[PDB]
Design a protein around this ligand. Structure first.
Ligand code: HEM
Ligand code: HEM
Lengths: 446, 446
C-alpha cells in the first residue's frame, strides 16, 4: 500500500517497507510535522506502518473535513483497534453510536451546568493555595506538576462523582489509589507497525487497564446511584446504560488530568519567564477581585488578559498536537481526491507555529489575542480544542477550571525561575506534549 | 460474547468457550440446521467461534432481511477477512462498492445478453455429447462429475473470455491448466475459531490462490482488450477498472464450476432413480425438438417439465445451503431486537425440506412445481437463488446453461443405476453440497 500517495501525485517522505515513516518520529511528532510542512508545502502524505496519512493545512479544506463533511465523510478518529469495553467512550465511538453519546452528553456541558460546578471547583483552588504554600515556605523550588497534578485529580473526582478529597494530603484514600492507578512506552509504536496484532490482544484478555481498576469503578458507580457529571448522567437515565457511564467517566478523568496540569505547568513557565505579563495579570486579577476576593463564574469571564494569556499558551502548546479523521468513502474536497480508508490529519502544533500566520511564532506574546488582533486569526489554523461537531466537548469546563486555579494562586504568589528551571523549555521526546524536564519554579508569598 | 442470545431471550445450543458451537458441525451444516430447527423452533442463535449467528425461518421476517431492509440494515455477507484484492468481487464487496459493481454488471446478465450466448453454449453441449459417448461405449459406468466438469469448464471459459477449448480432450492447454489450478480442508474451520489470525495471513503474503494463477489472468485480460462477459465489461469501460474485471471473472468461474456440474450430477441421479420422470422429460424434449433438433433460447423456455425437474432438484439440493447477511445496526424486525454485528442466516437447505411447507420432503416429486401447485409455494421458503437485491445475478444464465446441457444429453442417452451407484445418495460431510461418493451411472445410446 506504500504506493498510494505516489499514484495520487501527493508529495511526502519516501516510506520504508513495513515501517512506513515511523523512524522519522525520532524527533517527535511535532518536529516531523513541521519538517514535512516546510519541504512539501500545503498537503503531504506519509505512512504509519501500512496506514496512509494525509496531512492538510489549507483552512478551507480543514473546514470541509471538520465541519462541512463531518457526518458524511470524516466522522471518526483512527480506530486504535477494538481493545475492550472502551468502544462506548464518546471520544472513541463511531458514526451513529457517537452521535447518540454526543447528544446525551451535550446538556451536561452547558454553561448552566458549568456555573453550578464553579463553587465546587473553587473550594479546591483554596486547597491548592495551602499545599504549595507549605512547599513554598521550604525555600526550595517547587515541582508544579505535583501540586497541579494533585489539584487536577481533586477537581475531576468531585465534578464527576462527588468525592471530595485532598489527594496530596491523603496519600492512599481507597479512591485516590485506584484513580492514580507511560504513553512514551514502545508498545504504542509497535501497535502502529503491527496493527494486525491488536485482535490478538483483544482476545488474549490483555484488557486495557487492570481489572482491579475499572472493576473498582463499576462497583463505585453502583453505590453512588442511591451536582456532578455522574448525577447529570444518572438523572438523564431517569437512553444511557450503566457500563456506558463508567466509560465516559474514564474519558473525563484522562481528559482532566494530563491536560489540566500540563497546560497549567506551561502557563506558569511562561508567567515566570515573562514577569511583566505575570504582574499585568495580577493587576487585572486584583482589579476584578479586590483584596483576594473569591473568584466566581462571572468574574472569571470578566478578565480579558487572563483569557489572552491562556489562549497564547494553548497556541504554543496545543496538547492534542494533531486532529485526525478517517475518510469513510471515496470523496473529493477542495480540489483533490481522498480515497477511502486514508487518515486525514490536521497538524495543529505545526500550524500554531507557522510563520505564514504568526509573527515570530516562537515568542510568547499574549497581545495576539487582544480584541484588536483576535480578528486576524483564522479559526481553522488556531485549533487548540479542534473544531466542527466533534470538537472538545469540555472546552468551557477546561478553560474555567484552569482560570479559577490561576486566579487563586496568582492572588497569593509570584513565580520566578530557579537554578533548576529548564530555560528554554524543551518538549518531551516521544508523543505527549509535556516538558522534557518537569517545570520547577521559585514561589513566594504576596 | 457467548452470553448474547441468553440475554436476548433467544434459544439455542449451549456454546463452548472459544469454540462456540463448531463441534456441532460434525454432522455437516445441513444436519445441524435441521436439528436446531426441530428443537428450538422458528428462531435460534448459535456461535461460530465468538461470532453470534441468528437463524430465522419466518417468511415475513426473511422478506424483511432480504428485501425490505437490504440497503438499510442487511447489505453485506459475513466478511471472511480482508484476504486480498478479492475485495473488489461483487459477491464480496460491501455497501456502496457492491452497489456500484451490481449496477455495472446487471446489464451483462439480461435476457438479451443471455440469448446472445445461447449459440456459444450450444456448441459445447454437442462437444459434451461426444465425450460421454466415448465413455458410454466403454460399457463401464460413467463418473458424471468429470464429463460435466469438463463441460462446465468449457462453457465459462468461452462465455467470460472467448476461449473455445475442448478441455477433456485438451489435457493441458495453457489456459485449461491455469484455470484447473479442497473446501473441506480444516483451514476453513480454523479461520472461524481464529478470526483474529486472518490479519496475519493478509500481511504475510499468504495471498488467496497462488500468484502463478491470477497473474496469468491479469496478463491474459490485457491481451484480450484489443460476445462474452469480458467484452461486455470491456465495452462498459468505453466505470469499472482492469483489476476489478479480473476479480469478477474469478467469481464467475467458481460460480459456473462447482455449481453447474454439481446440480447436473444431482439431476442425473434423480432421473436415473426415477425412470418415469426421465422418459416423461425425454418425451417432452422430443416433442419440442423433433428428431434431436438443436435447442435454442426460446425452445428451452418452452419446456415446462424440464423447468419442474430442475426446480425440484434445486429444492432437495440448494447448493448454497445458507443465505447470510450482517446486521449493520441495532434494529428491530417483525417483533425482535437484532443487535449490531450479529450474522442473520436463512437456512435454505433446512427450509427446503421442512414438512411445515413440503409434503414428504425427502421424495423427489417434480409435480410440486406444476402450474397447479407452484402457487402454494412461498418464495421466501424456497430460495435456491436467494432473494432481494443481492440474489444470484446469474440465475437466468445458470438455468439456461444447465437446461441446454440436459436437453442435448437426454436427446441421445438414457441413464440407469449401476452396481457402483450410491443409492440412496449421501451428501458430502463437511461444508460443500456435493455427493459423498461421486455419482456413477450406466449410459446408453438412443
Ligand atoms: C486544556 C484542556 C483541553 C484541551 C486543550 C482539549 C483539546 C481537545 C481536542 C483538540 C480535541 C479533539 C477535537 C477534534 O478532534 O476536532 C478534544 C476532544 C475531546 N475532549 Fe478535550 N481538551 C481539553 C480538556 C477536556 C476536558 C476537561 C474534557 C472533559 C471533562 C474533555 C473532553 C473531550 C471529549 C469528550 C472529546 C471528544 C469529543 C467527541 O469525540 O465528540 N476535554 N479535546
Ligand atoms: C445452479 C446454479 C446457481 C445457484 C443455485 C446459485 C445460487 C446463488 C445464491 C443462493 C446466491 C446468494 C443469494 C443471496 O444471498 O440472497 C448467489 C449469489 C451470486 N451468484 Fe449464484 N448461483 C448459481 C450460479 C451462478 C452463476 C453461473 C453465476 C455467474 C456466472 C452466479 C453469480 C452470482 C453472484 C455474482 C452472486 C452474488 C450477487 C451479489 O452479491 O450481488 N451464480 N447464487
Amino acid at each position: 500500500s506504500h504506493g498510494l500517495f505516489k499514484k495520487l501525485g501527493i508529495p511526502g517522505p519516501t516510506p520504508l517497507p513495513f515501517l512506513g515513516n515511523i523512524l522519522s518520529y525520532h524527533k517527535g511528532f511535532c518536529m516531523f510535522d513541521m519538517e514535512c510542512h516546510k519541504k512539501y508545502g500545503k498537503v503531504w502524505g506519509f505512512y504509519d506502518g501500512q496506514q496512509p496519512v494525509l496531512a492538510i493545512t489549507d483552512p478551507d479544506m480543514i473546514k470541509t473535513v471538520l465541519v462541512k463533511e463531518c457526518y458524511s465523510v470524516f466522522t471518526n478518529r483512527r480506530p486504535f483497534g477494538p481493545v475492550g469495553f472502551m468502544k462506548s467512550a464518546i471520544s472513541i465511538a463511531e458514526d451513529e453510536e457517537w452521535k447518540r453519546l454526543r447528544s446525551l452528553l451535550s446538556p451536561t456541558f452547558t454553561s448552566g451546568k458549568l456555573k453550578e460546578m464553579v463553587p465546587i471547583i473553587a473550594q479546591y483552588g483554596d486547597v491548592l493555595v495551602r499545599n504549595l504554600r507549605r512547599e513554598a515556605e521550604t525555600g526550595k523550588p517547587v515541582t508544579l506538576k505535583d501540586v497541579f497534578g494533585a489539584y487536577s485529580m481533586d477537581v475531576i473526582t468531585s465534578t464527576s462523582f462527588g468525592v471530595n478529597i485532598d489527594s496530596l494530603n491523603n496519600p492512599q484514600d481507597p479512591f485516590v489509589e485506584n484513580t492514580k492507578k507511560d504513553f512514551l512506552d514502545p508498545f504504542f509504536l509497535s501497535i502502529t507497525v503491527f496493527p494486525f496484532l491488536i485482535p490478538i490482544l483483544e482476545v488474549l484478555n490483555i484488557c486495557v487497564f487492570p481489572r482491579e481498576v475499572t472493576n473498582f469503578l463499576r462497583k463505585s458507580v453502583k453505590r453512588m446511584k442511591e451536582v456532578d457529571f455522574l448525577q447529570l448522567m444518572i438523572d438523564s437515565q431517569n437512553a444511557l446504560s450503566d457500563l456506558e457511564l463508567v466509560a465516559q467517566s474514564i474519558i473525563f478523568i484522562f481528559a482532566g488530568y494530563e491536560t489540566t496540569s500540563s497546560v497549567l505547568s506551561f502557563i506558569m513557565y511562561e508567567l515566570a519567564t515573562h514577569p511583566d505579563v505575570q504582574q499585568k495579570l495580577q493587576e487585572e486579577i486584583d482589579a476584578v477581585l479586590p483584596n483576594k476576593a473569591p473568584p466566581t463564574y462571572d468574574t472569571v469571564l470578566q478578565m480579558e488578559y487572563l483569557d489572552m494569556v491562556v489562549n497564547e499558551t494553548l497556541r504554543l502548546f496545543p496538547i492534542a498536537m494533531r486532529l485526525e479523521r478517517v475518510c469513510k468513502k471515496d470523496v473529493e474536497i477542495n480540489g483533490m481526491f481522498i480515497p477511502k480508508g486514508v487518515v486525514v490529519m490536521i497538524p495543529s502544533y505545526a500550524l500554531h507555529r507557522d510563520p505564514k500566520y504568526w509573527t515570530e511564532p516562537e515568542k510568547f506574546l499574549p497581545e495576539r489575542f487582544s480584541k484588536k488582533n483576535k480578528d486576524n486569526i483564522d479559526p481553522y489554523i488556531y485549533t487548540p480544542f479542534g473544531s466542527g461537531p466533534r470538537n472538545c466537548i469540555g472546552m468551557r469546563f477546561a478553560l474555567m477550571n484552569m482560570k479559577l486555579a490561576l486566579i487563586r494562586v496568582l492572588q497569593n504568589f509570584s513565580f520566578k525561575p530557579c537554578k533548576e528551571t529548564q530555560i528554554p523549555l524543551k518538549l518531551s521526546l516521544g508523543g505527549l506534549l509535556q516538558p522534557e524536564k518537569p517545570v520547577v519554579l521559585k514561589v513566594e508569598s504576596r
